[PDB]
Amino acid sequence: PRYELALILKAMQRPETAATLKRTIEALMDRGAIVRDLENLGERALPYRISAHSQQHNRGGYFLVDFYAPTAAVESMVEHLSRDIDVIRGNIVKHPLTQELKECEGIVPVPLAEKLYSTKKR
Amino acid sequence: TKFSIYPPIPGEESSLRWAGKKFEEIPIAHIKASHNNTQIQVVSASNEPLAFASCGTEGFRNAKKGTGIAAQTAGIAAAARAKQKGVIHIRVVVKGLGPGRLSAMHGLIMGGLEVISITDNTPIPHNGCRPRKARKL
Amino acid sequence: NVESFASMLRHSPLTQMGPAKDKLVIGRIFHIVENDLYIDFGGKFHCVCRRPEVDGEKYQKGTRVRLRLLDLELTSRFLGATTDTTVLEANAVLLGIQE
Amino acid sequence: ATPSLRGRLARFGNPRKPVLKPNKPLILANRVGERRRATCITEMSVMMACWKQN
Amino acid sequence: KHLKFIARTVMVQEGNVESAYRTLNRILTMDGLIEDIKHRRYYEKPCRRRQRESYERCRRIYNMEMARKINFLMRKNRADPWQGC
Amino acid sequence: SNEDLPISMENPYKEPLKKCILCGKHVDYKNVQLLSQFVSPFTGCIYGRHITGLCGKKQKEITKAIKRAQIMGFMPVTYKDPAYLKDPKVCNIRYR
RNA sequence: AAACUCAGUUGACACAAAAUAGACUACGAAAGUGGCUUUAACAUAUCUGAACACACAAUAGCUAAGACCCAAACUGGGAUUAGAUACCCCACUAUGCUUAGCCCUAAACCUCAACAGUUAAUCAACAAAACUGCUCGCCAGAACACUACGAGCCACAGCUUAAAACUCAAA
Ligand code: FES
Ligand SMILES: [Mg+2]
Ligand SMILES: [Mg+2]
Ligand SMILES: [Mg+2]
Ligand SMILES: [Mg+2]
Ligand SMILES: [Mg+2]
Ligand SMILES: [Mg+2]
Ligand SMILES: [Mg+2]
């Protein structure tokens, strides 16, 4: 099915970042993923001090890899991403666009609960 | 501009200056307001120690420590010790909900030091390290 | 040759008016307390409005006024109540006198 | 808006297990509760400190 | 592992540390952190926690409905119009 | 019978439902700005639906997206991201 | 009081637990399930049906091997008391966690069986209004008795099933 790999890479030079992206996409393809797109979300300060491979990081480059892969390849890809040093973090998620905006006509009013007690007089 | 309660953004062109020093440069005042004891430690922008105080150090014993008066005494002592170090403006970072939580700041002020910010940092575990069983009295 | 009750109800002004929410009606001050005007506007229940601080002296019994109706009858059901409690009065906003 | 009481209580025809267990019936009473019932301490401390040092 | 002096930080305006501390306490109380700490001091066994949550929810329902009724009937606090009858 | 008799029909004066502000919009774990719009500036606590005004579905989606971003490194946990402080205020909260 | 010389800032740092959301009322047959991602996945019918079998069954507990932040029966000490084998304070172990097997008990209660249907002429009291059809399970005074004997069970101070004698006019 369709997955999106949200990837936080060590903030490094353009050649190193390109090499890491090539390596990751090559691993995806070898494991069978059909990479659909690659969008760069830029380099930014991480929301918290991530420590990957005994190396602490404050800034990182955020990338998305939209792809299609067999279900069995997700675990192998996760393991490879974990074993890769240059990747500060990486998570494979089900692509959001595979979800639908099923209609929600509004906030229907909930009437006060009725008949919750007997009408006994006291 | 009308006052903004939010602290200045780190690494940003903030206009605020206390004695010409930036907010990240202003020293810090860590206050631990334990249930029965209160402790105050003043540290530099580089977390270099500047002064220390507590109810026990000021001399209150046993239950007397966990009182607002002892907390104010400790605050005054810490402020006096820091003044000799040259601390004027401080950022208060108080953790714990002991009786001295506010009296510590009040004593730290009566000792002369000025406060620019209050930062509660009481350790709130999202969940972990199960606490001790409830007391039945 | 008699108009049916259904005909009268269909062609009466109160039926002409849709939901009373925010409609404009012409009320009549039929009773005044020190600073509380009880205004009848043709509905089942009257509304009660404080005498405006401006030209308050200008409001007097029979003074025809303009109201913006929020509810013909103020009622609501409350936790455990079998039937709605009603305050037996409309909720209207007093806009001023009409001439 | 008030929290929904629909399906909260244990009742016949309610498949779910109870969400609320009110020890008292959730019916409004005709009354409200009565209004439930150390200053100058700083001045006392200041005066006592002056006494201590004089 | 977060940036310090951003969370639960209040800048005292013109040195009124009293007002600044009161505002900070209001913020923490609204966010429920004070109650969370007070309860977390001692372990609340799951059954007791469930009972307390149920009681709080019932109390909230009752108090909100009572406040709604009080506000709804407030208009009827006016002076009696038909005095003498 | 009589033309003036009432006719069965749905309420023509029925008002449209107040769709929650996010209704019909795609909540994403990457829209850290929108996710930060629904957290406490000081504690980063996710606001309840009574505050946000969101429908149940959108409140659940917002909560799940906030958790996903926080654990995946897109969002802070203990505080609202400072860059988003001046974003439009859509939560019915008042501290000061 | 005993107890530790250890305590505070900052940095690194889990095989433990899972703030806020949740004022939501959802999932599962029940027990249970509220950090994130992925994989697999949530029986059938347009009925009921098991000590008569199969599969599950919170917490506690047993065997073996690991983990051990914190909590914690037991144990020790401090305090309390007339005494305190407790309530309060401190330390710590089994244990709570993981793996693989057992054990099969709960106020396992929403003390309200499953399916279908009704609101019509009501209803001992209280509780969570009163009923109709159908099927299964269970009950026939209290106590003896979550007991004895027999039987079965990885259970060996156990669990399920479960009496009788004597006694009472009550419960
Ligand atoms: S009101 Fe329609 S999605 Fe929330
Ligand atoms: Mg069957
Ligand atoms: Mg059975
Ligand atoms: Mg079991
Ligand atoms: Mg142990
Ligand atoms: Mg038993
Ligand atoms: Mg037996
Ligand atoms: Mg036997």
What the block records as the tokens of C10 is: 């269909």
Phi, psi of A22 (to 5 degrees): -60, -45
Residues B55, B70: Cα–Cα separation, whole Å: 5
Residues A84, A76: Cα–Cα separation, whole Å: 12
**Regarding beta strands B28-33 and B89-95, do their DSSP bridges make them parallel or antiparallel, or are they unpaired?**
parallel
* CA terminus-to-terminus distance, chain F: 66
Place of tokens 């005292």: E12
**Determined by which method?**
cryo-EM
Task: Tell whether B72 lies on the interface with D, counting CB pairs under 8 A.
Answer: yes
Q: How many domains does chain A have?
A: 1
Q: What is the domain extent for residue F16?
A: 2-96
Give every CB contact of residue F16 below 8 A, 6+ residues apart in sequence.
A106
Q: How far is the CA of D8 from the centre of ligand 3 (A)?
A: 29
List B118's β-bridge partners, or say none. Answer: B92, E10
Tell me whether residue A33 is in a domain. yes
Q: State the Cα torsion C56-C60-C65-C71 to the nearest 10°.
A: 90
Q: Which of F96, F43, F42, F31 is nearest to F69 (CA)?
A: F31
Residues F27, F36: Cα–Cα separation, whole Å: 12
List B38's β-bridge partners, or say none. Answer: B33
DSSP-H helix ranges across F9-80: 32-36, 49-52, 56-72
The CATH number for A57's domain is 3.30.70.60
- Which nucleotides of chain G have an atom under 7 angstroms from any protein CB? 1, 7-14, 16-28, 31-32, 35-40, 69-73, 87-90, 96, 110-112, 126-130
Q: Helix A14-31 crosses helix A73-83 at what angle (to 10 degrees)? A: 150
Q: Helix B101-110 crosses helix E17-31 at what angle (to 10 degrees)? A: 160
Q: How many domains does chain F have?
A: 1
Q: Strand locations in A1-119, DSSP E?
A: 2-10, 34-52, 55-68, 87-94
Burial class (CB in 10 A: 0-12, 13-18, 19+), B72: buried
Residues B29, B41: Cα–Cα separation, whole Å: 6
Tell me whether residue A101 is in a domain. no
To test the pocket of ligand 1, the residue of F18, F21, F23 to mutate (highest count of ligand atoms within 8 Å of its CB) is F23
Name the region of F79 (left: φ>0; alpha: ψ -120 to 50; beta: rest).
Answer: beta
Q: Which of A111, A112, A117 is nearest residue D25 as measured by Cβ atoms?
A: A117
User: B18 by DSSP, 3-state: which?
Assistant: strand
Task: Tell whether C38 lies on the interface with E, counting CB pairs under 8 A.
Answer: yes
To test the pocket of ligand 1, the residue of F26, F58, F60, F63 to mutate (highest count of ligand atoms within 8 Å of its CB) is F58
Place of tokens 């995806």: A28
Which of F33, F72, F84 is the mutation pick for testing A, counting most A CBs within 10 A?
Answer: F72
Q: Which of A84, A63, A76 is nearest to A7 (CA)?
A: A63
Cβ contact A11:A59 at 8 Å: yes
Entry resolution (Å): 3.2
Q: Which of A33, A104, A91 is nearest to A64 (CA)?
A: A91
Shortest Cα distance from B125 to chain E (angstroms)? Answer: 9
Long-range Cβ pairs for the range F54-59 (8 Å, 24+) = F54/F20, F54/F21, F54/F22, F55/A104, F55/A106, F55/A107, F55/F19, F55/F20, F55/F23, F57/A104, F58/A104, F58/F20, F58/F22, F58/F23, F58/F27
Residues A84, A62: Cα–Cα separation, whole Å: 16
If DSSP states are collapsed to H, E and C, what string results for C35-80?
CEEEEECCCCCCEEEECCCCCHHHCCCCCEEEEEEEECCCEECCCC
Strand order in the sheet with C64-71: C47-50, C36-40, C23-33, C64-71, C91-97
Q: Which of C29, C6, C97, C94 is nearest to C58 (CA)?
A: C97
Residues F31, A59: Cα–Cα separation, whole Å: 19
Nearest nt by C1' to F48 Cα: G21
Q: How many domains does chain B have?
A: 1
Which of C33, C45, C89 is the mutation pick for testing E, counting most E CBs within 10 A?
Answer: C33
Residues A11, A7: Cα–Cα separation, whole Å: 12
Burial class (CB in 10 A: 0-12, 13-18, 19+), B84: exposed
Q: What is the domain extent for residue A31?
A: 2-94
What the block records as the tokens of A54 is: 């005994």
What the block records as the tokens of F5 is: 């008799």
Place of tokens 């009786």: B99
Pocket of ligand 1 (CB under 6 A): A 104, 106-107; F 19-20, 23, 55, 57-58
What the block records as the tokens of A11 is: 């903030």
> How far is residue E41 CA from its own chain's centroid?
20
Residues A64, A41: Cα–Cα separation, whole Å: 8
Q: What is the domain extent for residue B79?
A: 1-137
